[PDB]
Amino acid sequence: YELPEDPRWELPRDRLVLGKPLGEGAFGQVVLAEAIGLDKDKPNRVTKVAVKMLKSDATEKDLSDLISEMEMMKMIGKHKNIINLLGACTQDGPLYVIVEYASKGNLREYLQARRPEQLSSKDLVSCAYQVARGMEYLASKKCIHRDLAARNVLVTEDNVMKIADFGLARDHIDYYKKTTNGRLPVKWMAPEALFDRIYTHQSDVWSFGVLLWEIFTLGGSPYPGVPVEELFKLLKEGHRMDKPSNCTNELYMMMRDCWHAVPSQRPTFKQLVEDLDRIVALTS
Ligand SMILES: COc1cc2nccc(Oc3ccc(NC(=O)NC4CC4)c(Cl)c3)c2cc1C(N)=O
C-alpha cells in the first residue's frame, strides 16, 4: 500500500480538520470536514467539505475501488451540477478523497422535509432541469451513471443539485437485496438494463423518468409494495406509473417519453435539458 502523489490535487493533512460523519454509510464512510485554504489564493479561509475514506476493516480491493473513483472524477472534470473533486490526501497516511460539500442532504430527504419552506412549482421543475444538465455533461463525457435516483442527487446550501455516484463501476448484482436504509434499487432500472444487463445513456434516461416522478411526488417511493417478481411482470406488461398529484400533463408526458419501451425512441438528456429549460421559464 504505497499510493503515488499527484501535486494537482494533493493537500497536506494538517490542512484538514475532520468532523461528524455523513449519510448513514450510504456512500461508504464519509465525514464532514474543514479544509484550511484549498484555494491557494485565499489560504486563510476554511471550506466545508466532504471526505470519503476506507473503513476500519477494508480489504486491499476496497482501496483499489476508491482510487478508481478518485481518478474517474479527475478525468470527468468540473460541472456545477455534479459532485466535483476538490483534493486528496494520498501521502503518509490513509487515503482521503475530498469533494464538494452538499449541506442540505440528498434530494429524497430534501423533498420530504419540504412537504406541506414551500417549493414553488418552479423550484421542482428548476430542480429537474439541473439534474438533466448534470447528466448531459456526464453523457457528453461518455459517463453512464447506472443508478440515477434522488437518493444519489445531493443538494447544496445554495440549493444546487449535484449528481453523485456516477460511474462507480462493478460487474450480476442481486435484485432482491435492498438498501438497508429502506430502498429496492431495481425500480429505477430500464427493462433492457434489468433483463439483458445492457446499460446505456438511454437506460439512464429511463431512470431520469423515475427521478422526475420522485421529484413531483416530493420524495415518493416508486412502485410501493411491489416486490421484485411482480415488478418484472409489470414491466413486461408495459405498465407505467400514474401521474403524480402535483404534476402537469406536459411533465407526465416527459416521464412517459423517458419510459418508452424502445430505448432509441427515448429522448436524450440534450433534448430533456432544452424542454425543461423552456418549461422552467413559464412556471410560478
Ligand atoms: C449532509 O448530506 C450529505 C452531504 C454530502 N456532501 C458531499 C458528499 C457526500 O457524500 C458523498 C457522495 C458521493 C461521493 N462520491 C462520488 O460522488 N463519487 C463519484 C465518482 C463516482 C462522495 Cl466521495 C461523498 C454527502 C453526503 C451526504 C449524506 N447525507 O449522505
Author numbering: 463 to 578, 593 to 647, 650 to 762
Give sentences from the paper.
Lenvatinib is an orally administered, multi‐targeted TKI that selectively inhibits VEGFR1–3, fibroblast growth factor receptor (FGFR) 1–4, PDGFR α, RET, and KIT 3, 7. Lenvatinib is an inhibitor of multiple tyrosine kinases including VEGFRs and FGFRs 3, 7. Activation of the FGF signaling pathways is associated with HCC progression, and proliferation of subsets of HCC is dependent on FGF signaling pathways 17, 19, 20, 21, 23, 26. In particular, the potent activity against FGFR1–4 is a distinctive feature of lenvatinib, compared with sorafenib.
Lenvatinib binds to the receptor tyrosine kinase VEGFR2 with Type V binding mode 28; this may contribute to its high affinity and its selectivity for a small number of receptor tyrosine kinases. Co‐crystal analysis with lenvatinib–FGFR1 complex revealed that lenvatinib also bound to FGFR1 with Type V binding mode. Homology modeling and docking simulation based on the lenvatinib–FGFR1 complex suggest that the mode of binding to FGFR2, 3, and 4 is identical to that to FGFR1. In addition to kinase profile, the binding mode with target kinases differs between the two drugs: lenvatinib binds to VEGFR2 in a Type V binding mode, whereas sorafenib has a Type II binding mode 28, 30. Here, we discovered that lenvatinib also binds to FGFR1 in a Type V binding mode, and homology modeling and docking simulations suggest that the mode of binding to FGFR2, FGFR3, and FGFR4 is identical to that to FGFR1. Thus, these differences in molecular characteristics of lenvatinib and sorafenib may underlie the differences in the pharmacological activities and mechanisms of action of these drugs. Lenvatinib inhibited the basic FGF (bFGF)‐stimulated phosphorylation of FRS2 in SNU‐449 cells, which express high levels of FGFR1, although lenvatinib did not show potent antiproliferative activity against the cells. Long‐term exposure to sorafenib confers sorafenib resistance on HCC cells with upregulation of FGFR1 37. Considering this result, lenvatinib has the potential to overcome such resistance by blocking FGFRs. We previously revealed that lenvatinib targets VEGF‐ and FGF‐induced angiogenesis 7, 8, 11, and therefore the blocking of not only VEGFR but also FGFR by lenvatinib might be behind its potent anti‐angiogenic and antitumor activities in the HCC models.
